[PDB]
Amino acid sequence: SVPSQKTYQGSYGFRLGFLSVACTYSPALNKLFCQLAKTCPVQLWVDSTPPPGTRVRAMAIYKQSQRMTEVVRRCPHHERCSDGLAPPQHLIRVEGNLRAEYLDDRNTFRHSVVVPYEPPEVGSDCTTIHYNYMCYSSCGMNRSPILTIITLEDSSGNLLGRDSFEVRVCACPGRDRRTEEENLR
Ligand SMILES: [Zn+2]
């Protein structure tokens, strides 16, 4: 199957926000450009606070239809060359959270990383999660574009909200964003 990428704000009005260049986001392209393994601040915005027990899942899928059923995973080189938490095959890691769970779906084999949902930090109207992408889009992904899908879920895994963004993991994020944006224009 293929995970849904349908945007769904849900009952809590859930949606994402985003902040050399380590990571840069293009609203026009709904695309995040980032360097390998670097900190990617992704913001969780809600109109109402979900209850304790709410979880936040991040999963990558291929954007292109001809590769949608394939599991996005690290290339062999990058799986070999770690915090001891993220499985070496997982593309997406969470940085700075002592409660990240790395999961593999029993039937689809897809990877995901989940952390407990936490209300906004002081001085902020959103909750920020720091993600790291462990393989380049060019490796493997081999130039195929991917989407990161973030889902807000209850403790049993039921959907509460969904949002998503394209991601390109690359050596020069700032330059590649300009290139793709100028091309859009
Ligand atoms: Zn790689």
Range 1-185 classified under CATH 3.40.50.2000: no
Q: Please provide the distance, in angstroms rounded to a whole number, between the alpha carbons at the two ends of the chain.
A: 35
CA of 61 to the centre of ligand 1 (A): 16
Q: Residue with structure tokens 């360097």?
A: 35
Residues within 5 Å of ion ligand 1, judged at the Cβ atom? 75, 78, 135, 139
Residue numbers in the known binding site for Zn(2+) are 75, 78, 135, 139
Beta bridge partners of 61: 147
- Partners of 162 in beta bridges: 8, 151
Helix (H) or strand (E) holding 173: helix 173-184
Residue 94 CA to ligand 1 center (angstroms) comes to 18
Coil vs helix vs strand at 76: helix
Please calculate the CA angle 127-128-129 and round it to the nearest 5 degrees. Answer: 125
How far does the centroid of ligand 1 lie from the alpha carbon of residue 11, in Å? 38
Give the Cα separation of 9 and 47 in Å (integer).
Answer: 9
Length of the chain: 185
DSSP secondary structure, 93-153, as one string: EEES-TT-EEEE-TTT--EEEEEE--PPPTT-SSEEEEEEE-S-TT---TT--EEEEEEEE
Q: Which of 184, 175, 183, 166 is nearest to 62 (CA)?
A: 166
**Token pair of 86, please?**
């993220």
CA of 91 to the centre of ligand 1 (A): 9
Tell me the helices (H) and strands (E) count for the chain, helix number first: 2, 11
